Each structure stands twice: as C-alpha cells, then as structure tokens.
Paper text:
To better understand the differences between mouse and human POLγ, we employed single-particle cryogenic electron microscopy to determine the structure of the mPolγWT-DNA complex. Following the approach used in previous structural studies of hPOLγWT-DNA complexes, we introduced a single mismatch in the DNA substrate to induce POLγ to shift from replication to proofreading mode, capturing three conformations: the replication (R) conformer, the error-editing (E) conformer, and an intermediate (I) conformer. As expected, mPolγWT-DNA complex adopted all three different conformations, with reconstructions refined to resolutions of 2.7–3.0 Å. The I conformer was also similar; however, the catalytic site and Y933 residue could not be modeled in the mouse structure due to high flexibility in the fingers subdomain. Additionally, we observed a slight difference in the position of the distal POLγB subunit. However, in the E conformer—and to some extent in the I conformer—the accessory POLγB subunit occupies distinct positions relative to POLγA, highlighting a key structural difference between the human and mouse complexes.
Residue numbers in the entry:
A (entry chain A): 52 to 71, 81 to 149, 151 to 163, 170 to 231, 246 to 296, 328 to 480, 508 to 607, 626 to 640, ...
B (entry chain B): 41 to 192, 203 to 328, 343 to 457
C (entry chain C): 42 to 192, 204 to 328, 344 to 458
Write the structure that this text describes.
DNA sequence: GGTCGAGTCTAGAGGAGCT
DNA sequence: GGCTCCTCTAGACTCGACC
C-alpha cells in the first residue's frame, strides 16, 4: 500500500520497483472546492511477474517495441521511395495476374494497389492494377472474361484477388484488402496495409468544417479525393476519370467493350497514388516521429471480423422483418386512400376537413321462360363458337382507341398519382405509392394537433387550421367541437385560408424552421400526451417507423458487406475438430473497410462497424455486432477503457497544476468515486501543437500559421482525441508484442473508439486476459511518466474487467434481443453468456505469469 | 348489422338462428358454411396448402381415416362406433339379462373403433411410410386437412389443418420457434388487422413447452393454432420400442425425431377472416374472396349482349377466375342495389356489358376497394384480372 | 402388379393384407399414400371444375359426416356412443335388468349415425340454395366428401351432384348428365371404352343409370345416376309445399331430383388401373409434373439454380419434385424408371451447361425424348402443355 | 407543320444520423 | 455548431401523338 500526500492510492511496491513542497498549494485549491480530506478505502494490492522492461524506462520500452514491430515495413515502404520501373505499359485481357515487364502471383514485397469493381456484379472485384518495383501488375476477373450464364452469388477465396513481411499501399487500401483472397483466412498471413488517405489525414487533414469550405490553409491541405491529394502533394496535370462511369453506371458488356480504356484509367490512379505516397512517407515520418504511432496505425489496418452461416440468416430475417413490418404500415395507409375515393360521389369531398384541397377532377375515356331442356350435343359446339367468335371479332377494335393508354380517368387526380401506371413493371394494386413522408398521408390519416386538422403550406410547411375548392371551415369547427383561444407557434396570416388562422406546428430547431412531416420521432412524445392524436394504426405507424429507421438507412450497407465464406479445406484444424463444429454450416469473415485515419483527430472511421450500433430491443437489424461470432474453438477477449479521454484530460490537468495525481479537483474526482483547459489551450496555441505523449504534430490545416487564431475548438478537441489515439497505439503495440513474444495464438479483431477486441483461442484466453491487463497497466504508466509524474494511481492501473465472449457485444450479459432477433443469441444460436474477469481472478487463473 | 346475419344472408353461413350463436359456431356440431363460405374455406384451405405443403420443403400430404382403433384407456373420451345390427341381434333375438348384457357393453369400450380427435395419430401411423419416401433424411413432416371429432353429449366436428414435424431433439426448440414464426406470418398475411393474431406460450400436463396462436374474436381470443414439443413418447407409444424403425438421418448419426404438432383450425380460420374483413363490405383478401368477377348485361339487345357475355364468361373461367354470371338473373336489379349486393358478397369487380360494347368493345369495370368505374376493352379484361390477382398473392 | 407397384411409389398405403381387391374396395383403411392423395386431389379438382365452375347454376355444399339418427329398422349405419355414458352406467349405481335393456334401445332411438350418401346433406341445403337462384329451376348442388358404408366400417369419398330439374325433361336432363359424365370420365381415360353406361331401375321402380369401369376383376359402379323424383325431397320437407316449389317458366313446380353420384376413391383406382413401368396418368391428373435434379458438381452452384427454378415453377402452380435435395445418387436410367412409375410428366436436369448457356435437359414421360430448352423457356413450355391438355 | 398531355431531369427543402 | 443522404415536390424542357 502506497499513498501520495493527498492520500491517493498508488501502485504497490512490487509493481513500482519493476516499473519505476507543492502539496500545500494543492490542498488550498482542493479545500476551496470542498474535496479536502474524505479518504477512500485501499484497493487490494496487486502483484505481477511482469517481463523485464526493455531500455529501462517505459518510454524507451515502447519505442523499442515499435522499432522491432514496424522495422521490416519501414524498409518495405522505403523500397517504393527509391524504386525504378518502366512507364505505364498494352492492356491484357487474359485471366489472373499478368506481369508487365520492361507470375501466378506478384512476388515483390511492396505494392501500390487499386481495385475497380463493377456494381452490376455487386461485390466481386472486376479489375485491379498494382505498382511494384521493376514491374507493373494488372488483374482481370474471370467474370469479366468468360461471360457465363450465371456465377456463384456467395463469395469465397476462389473468386478473389490472390497474393502471397510485405507492405501494400493504396488510396483506400481497405478496398484493396477487402478484395484480397488471403486476408479472410483465420491464419494471419504477415502482410500489412498502409493507406495514403490515412497519411494525408494525418499530415494535412481538413476538419469537418474545413472540407465544406474547401470543396491560407487551402494551399497546404486538400480533400481526401485522389485528384485533390495528387494536386496537393505532387500537382502537375490534373487527374480525369472516364465520364461514362462504366463500373458504377455501365453494365458488364460496356466494361468488356472498353477494357483497354479502364485499364488506363486505373493505371493512372495507381501511379498518382504512388506519386502521393512518395511525398507522404517522409512528411508523415516527420510530423509523427514516434514509431508507436505508425505501429498502431499498421495494427489498426488489419482489423478482422469472423462470421458464420448465421450472417445470411441475419440478413434474410432482418430484411423480411423490415418488409413485413413495412407492409403492415404500407397496407394500413393504402386502405385509408381507398376509403376516401368514395367521397367523390355526391361532391362530399368539399366537406372533408383534410382532403378538400386535392384533385378530384375526372377525365373522359376518349377514343380516336320455360326450361328449354338440356342443350343438345350439336348445340354445345354451336353455342360455344358463336359466343367465342363474338369476342374474337371485337378483338379487331384494338386500333379504335388511342395508342397511349389513358391512365385511370375514373379515379380522382390525387388517387391517380398514388397509383402506378399499368405499364409500370413495379405496378401493384391500389395506391402503391403511398408513404408516411408524402404530404397526403397526414391528410389521409386525418391527423389532428391538439384538436385541429393539419394542413400544408408550400412555404410554412405543415400546420393546423384553427377555425375563425373552398376550405370546409364548418367541418373544421365541427371537428373541434367533437374534440384567439390558441397561442402556439405564431399564426402566419399570409397563408390566408378563409375562416381560419394558420398556426404552424412546433419544430425541434425553433420557429425559424418549418415542419416537413408530423410523423417525425420528435413528435412521438406529443403523440402520447394526447396532442397529436391521429385519426384512422396511429402510434403503431410511428413505432414501425422507429423500429425500421435504422434498417431503412443501413440495409444497403449491411446487406452489401463483402462476406467471404471460407471453405472447409481452408479452415484451421482447430475449427474442424471443435465439438461445436457442424458440417452443414459454412464459416467466413468480413474485412471492415476501415480507414486508419479519417479525422483531424486521427480516429479510424467506418460507417458500419466503427459506429456504436449496440443491440436495441426496439430496432430491426441492430444485432449487427452480435452477428460477429467467433468460429468454434475461438473466443473474443476484449476490454473497454474506463473513461479514456476523461482520464487523459484529468492527468493532463494533474501534470500541470501541482505535478501530481489528484492535485486538481477534476483529477481528484476522476481518480476515485480548469487546469486541464489551461494546458489544452497552451498546447493548442503553441507554434506547432503536439501530442503530450508521442509528440504527434497537428495537421498543417490547423497550425496557427495558416489559421490565425482560427478553429480553436477543433485544435482543443484534437489534443485530447489524438492523445486517445496515442493510447490506442500504445495498447495495440504492447498487445502485439506480448502475443508474439509469448507465442499466444491470436490476432487483433477490431477497435472501436474506446474498445479493444482480440480473436483468441479458448485454450489461451486467460493468458490473453493477463496480457491485456499488463498492456493497460504499462500504457497507463507510460502516460503518467511522459507528463512528468513519477507514479501511477492504483484505481486506474487495471481494467474493471476483461470480457471473454463468443460474439461482439457491449456486455457479456446482453442477449441482444431485437424485433428481428426476439429469441436472443442464447436460444436461436446457442451463444452462452460470457465471462467478466477482474485483475485478481486473472492472476489466480494464470498463477501470476505466462 | 351483425356479421353473422350478413354472412347468413349472403350465403357465407348456413344454419338456423339457434345454430348461429357464438358457442354453436365454435362447437362445429353443424355445417356452418353456405355456398359462399364453403368457397371461402376452400380458398383458405388452399392458401394453407400452398404455404405449408407446396412452398415448404419436406412436407407431404397424408390420408387418415376418421376412425381410430379401439383403445381400452379409461381416460379416452372419443366416440365409439357400434353396429346397429349387433345391438338388435343380442337384445331382441334372445331374452336379455343383467349378467349377459354387461359382456356386450364391456366389449364396446374394448374393441370398437373410435372417431379420431386429432390428425397426429394418423401422421404417426404414416411416419414410417414417409421414412422410405424421404430416405430417412431428417427433418420432414406430414400435413393434412380433415375433419376431427371432439366431444361437446354431442359430436362436434372441426376441420383441422395439422402439420406433424419430425426433427432431431437438438433443433426441436428451433423448429418449434420457426413454425411459430412461419405460422404467425401466414395468418397475418391475409388479415386486414394483423395485430389481432397473437401468440402466447403454454405448458401442457406433462410440462412440455408449447405455443398457442390466438385470434382476438370480439368475445375474446380463441386458440386457432397450438404448437407442442411432444418429444419421443408419442412415437414410443405407437411403436413397440423397436428403435430400428424410429430412427432417421439427422446428419451423420441417427436420432429418434422429436415430434412437433402445429394444429391450425381451418373452420375457425374462416370465421376469423370473416370477422377480420368486416358501407357494408366484406374486405376479404383477393386470394380468399369466393367471387371475383360479376358479369352483367345492359338495356338491349339482350340476345346480342348475352353472346358477348357467354364468350366472356368462358374466357375468364378458362383462366382460373371465379365469375358470377349476373346476366342470367331473372329479375332486373338497379345499379345501387346490385353494387351493394356485390359488395356484401365480396365481389372484386363488377363488369357490365351494354349495347355500346358491340361497336367499340369497351366495358365498365368497377372496383370493390375504390367504388370507381373505369372503362376497358374486352380484349384486355383478362390481362388485368390475372395481373390484379397475381399481385395480390 | 399395379397394387404392389403403387405401394412402392407411395400411391398405396397399408399392410400387405390390406392391399387386396376386397380390402381396397372396402375403404376400411387409408389406401392412398402421399402421392395417391395428390392424384385423388386432382380428380376432386377436375370433377369440381367440369361440374361446378363450367356448369350453369351449380353450387358448393358442405355437410356433416354424422346424421340425426332414427329408430327405424332396416338401416345399418354405425352409431356413435359416448364412452363416458357407457362407463357411467356400469360403474356408478349398478342399474337393474330393465335399465340395461333400455340403454341398448337408447343407443338406437336417439344416438347419431354416420352418413352413407351425400344426398341427404344437399337436401337440407336445398331451401337455402333455392334462395341463391331466386327460386329458379333448374339448378344443382355438388359436394365431395367421405361416406361410410358397413362391411367394420368402410370410408368412401363420394363426389355427388344433386341436380334439381322440373318434372318435364327430367329424362332428357338425365341423359344430359349421363352423356357428360361418360364424356368426363372418358376425357382423361386412355381406354375410354372401359367406361360404360347401363340402364338400371330402383327398387321403387324409379328410372336410373349406372357408370361402370372394367376393372380386371369386373365392372364396378364408379358412378350411379338415379331419377329420384320428389319423394326423397318431400321426405326431408313434409307438410307445407310452398318452400319446396321452384319457380319454373310458367308455374311453380316441385323439382324432380336427379342424383348424380360418383366415387373418387374408386375412381382413383380406375385411373390407376387405366394408366397402367410407367403410369400414363392424364396431364391434368398426374400428381407430380416436374422432377428437378442436379447432374454433377458444383452442387452449391447448381442447387441455387434449381432452387431459383423451383421457386418459379411453384409460383406458377406447377407441382415439382425437388429430387436434388437427396444425398444418394443413381444412374440416369434408374431416375427415369423411378419417375415414370411415379407418373412424373417431365424430368428436368440442371448440369454445368445450365451455368454456361442455360440449356437444360427436358425429358417427356409420354414420348421418352429429351428436349434441350433454355431455363427461361422452361416455364412457358410447361404452362402451354398443361393448358392444351386441359382443353 | 401546328398544339398539348405525358416523361424526365434538376433544383430545393425537410427528417434521421453522427459528433 | 457543423455537415451528409433519402424522400417528396414544383417547375421547365422535350417528345410523339393526334389532327
């Protein structure tokens, strides 16, 4: 038990020995806020047999780890920087990889890469071009050459880009890696992918606001587009893409007929990527000198998500639930439109409070006895033909009517627009074009806002007509009686509806905006309060919209994820022998197309995986992360960093005020239970802001030179967020070091903003948990050490827990119940609840060492 | 007006006012469906057959008699079949006695056949039969629509659409949940208000897991379909423990398949869809409505018009569309009455052929859903009717 | 033999002792398997379409299997007795000798009985279906259902039309149905001379006719037409006559009842005997139309083609046999002989060439020729062939 | 060679999604 | 304090269809 003068618990002697006058001022500020005294109980002492730290101090240790981890890849990158090769070579229509001289697979260890994909085939790669020293390389898919009737709709390593200590570079290497055959295998082939887009975002990254203005600092930065980056780093003649856009808008035949041009439009992009990288590599090695940054980036570039046959089941179930739940909402709206067409008869539509202002005009269809007894046998044929011929004769009157078929003249004008044309291939019976977003739906549903019918103004948006084709003011009064005196949003009299005052509906962004659809979830609280009471469903429509809102936006992403199912022959022997294996299923992986950088804060971004899409009980498809299930024999060891950015800000505040942990009120409250802002502003307003740990410089678009006191918020946010990215770099480097030195069979799985997940065998799982705890402890120690603090508190030394779970989810106790997954993962898939282990439990199970 | 009274008038229901009570319609002791209600059920039984036997894999039809062999179990309540001649022969041809007559009554409960109560025991007797058919490839099932007799005493008859699913014990909890989801979608497919169909878990006297579908009838929910995880005992009872004939191929090994019984109520199903679909219109689903087209004639000449309609009638009938020949009616009916008559009968389209049809060929075509009249040429009438019905499926 | 052949191919069902001429005609056992039901399901549809859909003023009837019951003798319908009531007498209070005699009398005086014909089911629905035609004559009532005839108890599925016609032209209408029924049965027959009509008379002297089928053991009455007159209709409706009289073209006339009755359980045996290593069932009667299989590898690729092809045919109303799902393999000839005796109309094979240009092999049951046809043109050909055979 | 009632494309505005 | 994507709607140009 060790305590600081402020009674803050610190590391034990056993850990401190291996790893490693201002008190009065600190107490005065502490007592002023009211945090003086009030001690806390000491946590149990933790002792470990940590491996001998290289180079003495922690900083030298991590530097040596990075320099031993990323050493071959630095040389691989340097190979391109001094490479020589002939210029852009004729295009080859053959199959496989072709070597363009001055082999089944490219042999060299350095490859600038780019892939072109035809969207008609969806996801299978179409062609790719590779730049390598002494020889260009070109790739052509077997679907582009052979032109067969049909192909395999499920992907596999067979129909992928093949290959075989090697660095692969590109503009969106993610795309390059996601199409490489060998990157989906559970066995980790030692290839690392380095991104020019990530290095651009690190060197001269433009913020969210800056790119909006860019599309001063403008001469030193550019957008992530390849043309912009080439103009920035290299310049010269601009890049041009083919205006036909065959890969995106053209069919496969057009790509067949213009192959010799697409092979040039891709070679140009590959050469531009090489030219950019030539200037990016030394510039990035200058801006970020600490090798841990590059090592952590290379570790973030190898994210690997395993899946199984449940992924197709997940997609099918989610899509079908979305359709059925949408069909229930759609079919409920259609019946409301059909029930309103009857108001035409008798001119009763003029009395409808909602459908008065519609097109009810009608077109015209203009052109250019006793029992006889049983019919006899001859009468059977005679009667048949005379009736049959009396119709075939009328078949000749086809030319007496206009060529273009007049569309539903009998149906009213508003109903014609809701009904697709008879010649439409997507024609469905009834008003098949109805939706909640349409302006007729709030009128079809007879919506009321606090007892007033709704109405749409072309300028003010949706509003309600307070009483006070001609609008049926009498009907408006009648409804209010069934359900000046109102003072809601300001009554706009410019609308000038006779006998009514048009009060606009309230909006979430204030009265300066207009309401576009009263079915917005913002009004859901108003629906339950009895204000926005629907007429002829109702809240169920809002509930369905809320449940399917995620899938509506994200199904074209989730369903389109490039899943490659491994064959049985390609699976490791462990999976082919675990008791949970089943021959009738198929197992695969998803390579998240994660860009290592992507923000000024150097955070990794991905629209699908790196978003906190945790399972929800009221959301279709929200079990997306729960579908990342380790194959039999493997488990997902992971941990969540407890208040990562919060503790970084606290320790930055602590290292400045009195130079010890807890000296600040914010740090005191963080460690247990404005100096931080001053230090952040000092770092941001310096000549060149740098990360307080790894010394990573800020982007050239935010240096105070180009921006004279501009974008202060972006810089101050960048300080903390880039410190968090440095923390992630340290964690990944230390984890890889511990995995490789102690021979643990595992690999990095994925790292969302604040999580670190590892795919490891159940055999070596507690070893991985101990490795993770040690990496956390060492990272915290280094973070404290680099700030001028000679000690680390016990309370943040180790994780709260390290999860060991069969699938990816926020907590091991969550069954991930969703409308599309109501039985959960335990029932439908048999995934058991995972284990959460504290430091002491891991020590007990691992006997204090590995 | 009440729905039962409306369906009685339009021949969806049949029976006396005493037989049309809520309880009497539930019991099934009486043919409750008229000429149209039989066609509505015949559509519903065909929709169940397509979804459960045609589109689903490893599902087959099965022929099961209405008579089960006599079981001596005292707990049984199934009605027994007794020969009327046998009763007369013993009772009348000799002097009866208290000692001798009991021998005849005891033999009745011991050997006489009984009316079946469920289609399960018929499927189990055919279980071995399908094992040759599917070459033991688990899982599989047998499905049947037939009359099941349950005591009320009175013998109530209800048409049950059963599916007996034979799956290994590992996937029994999965297929029980799979069919429960597959069933609830089929029932909700045709419903105007899918929220009325619900499911609630239940346990039987042996503690086996179960799930019962309901339809929220106006008086209350009724279990139109119950699913059970029966297990091996039903197979172990019908077959005398010889495992060779019970085990099927559940992958590489052989396992006795767990029996799952899904038992929809077709007779109660049509009753739900009549309540579900209910101006006075039976908004029955186009795949369920009995009458889809309603031909007619105009002012005159009626002889020339009837030649067109008769040729039109054969055009639709040969194309699988049910037609109501309203041109043969012997009493003139006004349009306002003829339209409400077709609406209550759930007629999709009211075709009308007039004298103008003889020159240009344009016929009026009204819609039940919209009540709007649109003209169309005769040559294109069949194309629209097939298209509307195909898109409704 | 056909009896054994239909057993192997699951047209027949039951123990070897139950697959006998006396047992098959008895109806005391389920004599149809999974395939036999579908073939018998086709006869039910073909009978229904040609006798209800295409016929003028014919309507559907559904009736109970049980009947109210009567104490009159000479009827042998098996009664229904509650076992609980039987156990109540024996176990509760030991009733005297007189009570036991009364109990057996009560089992005949009030207990219900199983139906023997569908005629009485239609007659109770004559009044309501008279309202359907606005009391116009003639019209009919048709139904397919199971009837019970003593032997044990036998079950027979009868297809019965009760035609209500005026007293005038009743003989002509009987000849009308006699010709149509003989033509309907001969429509699907490969040997139409096996279906015969013979004049027969009722015990009450009423005129009638019978339709036979020359089974290998002898001609059996698969269909029987009786000119019942109004005695049967007046029996169910005694007293007032206004509710029974139909509105003829000149006066209210009680309709003479024509009872067109036919057996589809016995009819299916006829078309099983008529078709017979290939059962040449009529294209409208064969239970399996298409046989889908995979020729070789890739199994994963071909099975997707078949599953896509299968889903198309099933949506078009064509019954298919998904043979590709089997893990066992046999020679192509063994598949051909297997499918012919299963009465499969067409055999489709999805090979590697299907993945290259879409051409598949289409074998015809009747001609034994294999036609090479594109995948997209398969469904068009199948619908065309079935439509032409129906007409 | 003339009017004119459907296609079609672009431009604009609002809700949901992330910080 | 910011965008970005999906959906609905209004307006102007084009077309071919009929006369």
């Amino acid at each position: 038990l060790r305590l600081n003068p402020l009674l803050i618990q610190m590391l034990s002697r056993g850990l401190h020995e291996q790893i490693f006058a201002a008190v009065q001022r600190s107490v005065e500020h502490l007592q002023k806020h009211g945090l003086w005294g009030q001690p806390a109980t000491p946590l149990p002492d933790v002792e470990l047999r940590l491996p001998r730290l290289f180079g003495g101090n922690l900083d030298q240790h991590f530097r040596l780890l990075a320099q031993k981890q990323s050493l071959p890849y630095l040389e691989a990158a340097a190979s391109l920087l001094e490479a020589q090769l002939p210029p852009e070579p004729s295009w080859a229509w053959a199959e496989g990889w072709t070597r363009y001289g001055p082999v089944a697979i490219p042999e060299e260890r350095a490859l600038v890469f780019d892939v072109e994909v035809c969207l008609a085939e969806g996801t299978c790669p179409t062609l790719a071009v590779a730049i390598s020293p002494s020889a260009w390389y070109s790739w052509c898919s077997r679907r582009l050459v052979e032109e067969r009737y049909s192909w395999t709709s499920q992907l596999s390593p067979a129909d992928l880009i093949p290959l075989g200590e090697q660095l692969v570079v590109g503009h969106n290497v993610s795309f390059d890696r996601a199409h490489i055959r060998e990157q989906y295998l559970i066995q980790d082939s030692r290839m690392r992918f380095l991104d020019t887009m990530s290095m651009h975002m690190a060197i001269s990254g433009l913020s969210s606001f800056q790119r909006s203005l860019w599309m001063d600092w403008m001469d030193i930065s550019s957008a992530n587009n390849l043309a912009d980056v080439h103009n920035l780093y290299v310049g010269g003649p601009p890049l041009e893409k083919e205006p036909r856009e065959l890969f995106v808008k053209g069919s496969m035949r057009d790509i067949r007929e213009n192959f010799q041009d697409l092979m040039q439009y891709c070679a140009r992009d590959v050469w531009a990527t090489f030219e950019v990288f030539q200037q990016q590599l030394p510039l990035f090695l200058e801006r970020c000198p600490h090798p841990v940054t590059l090592a952590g980036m290379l570790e973030m570039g190898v994210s690997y998500l395993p899946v199984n046959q449940n992924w197709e089941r997940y997609l099918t179930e989610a899509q079908n639930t979305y359709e059925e739940l949408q069909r229930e909402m759609k079919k409920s709206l259609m019946d409301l439109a059909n029930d309103a067409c009857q108001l035409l008869s008798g001119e009763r539509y003029k009395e409808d409070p909602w459908l008065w202002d519609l097109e009810w005009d009608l077109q015209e269809f203009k052109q250019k006895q006793e029992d006889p007894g049983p019919p006899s046998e001859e009468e059977e044929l005679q009667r048949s033909v005379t009736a049959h011929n009396r119709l075939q004769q009328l078949r000749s009157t086809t030319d007496l009517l206009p060529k273009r078929p007049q569309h539903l003249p009998g149906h009213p004008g508003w109903y014609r627009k809701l009904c697709p044309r008879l010649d439409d291939p997507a024609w469905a019976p009834g008003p098949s074009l109805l939706s909640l977003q349409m302006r007729v739906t709030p009128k079809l549903m007879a919506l009321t806002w606090d007892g007033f019918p709704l109405h749409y103004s072309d300028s003010h948006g949706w509003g309600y007509l307070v009483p006070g084709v001609t609008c049926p003011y009498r009907a408006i009064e009648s409804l209010y009686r069934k359900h000046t005196y109102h003072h809601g949003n300001g009554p706009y009299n410019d609308v000038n509806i006779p006998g009514c005052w048009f009060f606009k509906l309230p909006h979430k962004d204030g009265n300066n905006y207009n309401v576009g659809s009263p079915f917005a979830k913002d009004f859901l609280p108003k629906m339950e309060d009895g204000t926005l009471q629907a007429g002829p469903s109702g809240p169920r429509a809002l509930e369905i919209n809320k449940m399917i809102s995620f899938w509506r936006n994200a199904h074209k992403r989730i369903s389109s994820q490039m899943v490659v199912w491994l064959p049985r022959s390609a699976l490791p022997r462990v999976v082919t022998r675990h008791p949970s294996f089943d021959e009738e299923g198929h197992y695969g992986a998803i390579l998240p197309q994660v860009v290592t950088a992507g923000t000024i804060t150097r955070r990794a971004v991905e629209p699908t995986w790196l978003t906190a899409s945790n399972a929800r009980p009221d959301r279709v498809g929200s079990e997306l992360k729960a579908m990342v299930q380790a194959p039999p024999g493997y488990v997902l060891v992971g941990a969540d960093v407890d208040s990562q950015e919060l503790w970084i800000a606290a320790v930055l505040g602590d290292a400045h005020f009195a130079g010890m942990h807890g000296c600040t009120a914010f740090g005191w409250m963080t460690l247990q239970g404005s100096e931080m802002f001053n230090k952040l502003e000092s770092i941001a307003m310096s000549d060149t802001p740098r990360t307080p740990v790894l010394g990573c410089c800020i982007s050239r678009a935010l240096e105070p030179s180009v921006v004279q006191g501009e974008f202060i918020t972006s810089r101050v946010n960048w300080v903390v967020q880039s410190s968090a990215v440095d923390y992630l770099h340290l964690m990944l480097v230390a984890m890889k070091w511990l995995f490789e030195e102690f021979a643990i069979d595992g690999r990095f799985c994925i790292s969302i903003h604040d999580e670190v997940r590892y795919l490891v065998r159940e055999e070596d799982r507690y070893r991985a948990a101990l490795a993770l705890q040690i990496t956390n402890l060492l990272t915290r120690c280094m973070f404290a050490y680099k700030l001028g603090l000679n000690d680390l508190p016990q309370s943040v030394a180790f994780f709260s827990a390290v999860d060991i779970d069969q699938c990816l989810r926020k907590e091991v106790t969550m069954d991930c119940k969703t409308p599309s997954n109501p039985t959960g993962m335990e029932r439908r898939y048999g995934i058991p609840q995972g284990e959460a282990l504290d430091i002491y439990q891991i020590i007990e199970l691992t006997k204090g060492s590995l | 007006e009440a729905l039962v009274d409306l369906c009685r008038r339009r021949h969806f229901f049949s029976g006396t006012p005493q037989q049309l009570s809520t309880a009497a319609l539930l019991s099934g002791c009486h043919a409750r469906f008229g000429p149209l209600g039989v066609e509505l059920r015949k559509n519903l039984a065909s929709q169940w057959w397509s979804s459960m036997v045609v589109f689903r894999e490893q599902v087959f039809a099965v022929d099961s008699l209405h008579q089960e062999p006599g079981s001596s179990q005292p707990r049984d309540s199934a009605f027994r079949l007794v020969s009327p001649e046998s009763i007369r022969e013993i009772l009348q041809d000799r002097e009866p006695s208290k000692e001798q007559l009991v021998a005849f009554l005891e033999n009745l409960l011991k050997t006489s056949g009984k009316l079946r109560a469920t289609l399960l025991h018929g499927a189990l007797e055919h279980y071995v039969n399908c094992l040759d058919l599917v070459n033991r490839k688990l899982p599989f099932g047998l499905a049947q629509i037939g009359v099941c007799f349950h005591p009320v005493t009175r013998v109530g008859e209800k048409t049950e659409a059963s599916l007996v699913w034979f799956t290994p014990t590992r996937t029994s909890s999965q297929w029980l949940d799979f069919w429960l989801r597959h069933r609830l979608l089929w029932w909700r497919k045709f419903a105007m208000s899918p929220s009325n169909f619900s499911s609630a878990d239940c346990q039987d006297e042996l503690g086996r897991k179960g799930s019962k579908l309901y339809y929220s009838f106006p008086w209350g929910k009724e279990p139109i379909e119950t699913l059970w995880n029966l297990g091996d005992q039903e197979l172990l009872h019908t077959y005398p423990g010889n495992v060779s004939t019970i085990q099927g191929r559940d992958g590489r090994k052989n396992v006795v398949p767990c029996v799952l019984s899904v038992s929809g109520d077709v007779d109660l199903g049509t009753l739900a869809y009549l309540y579900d679909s209910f101006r006075k219109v039976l908004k029955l689903h186009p795949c369920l409505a009995p009458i889809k087209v309603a031909l007619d004639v105009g002012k005159g000449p009626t002889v020339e018009l009837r030649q067109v309609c008769q040729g039109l009638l054969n055009e639709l009938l040969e194309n699988g569309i049910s037609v109501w020949p309203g041109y043969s009616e012997t009493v003139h009916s006004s349009l306002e009455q003829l339209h409400s008559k077709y609406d209550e009968m759930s007629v999709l389209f009211s075709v009308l052929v007039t004298e103008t049809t003889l020159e240009n060929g344009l016929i009026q075509l009204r819609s039940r859903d919209t009540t709007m009249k649109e003209m169309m040429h005769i040559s294109k009438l069949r194309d629209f009717l097939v298209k509307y019905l195909a898109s409704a499926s």
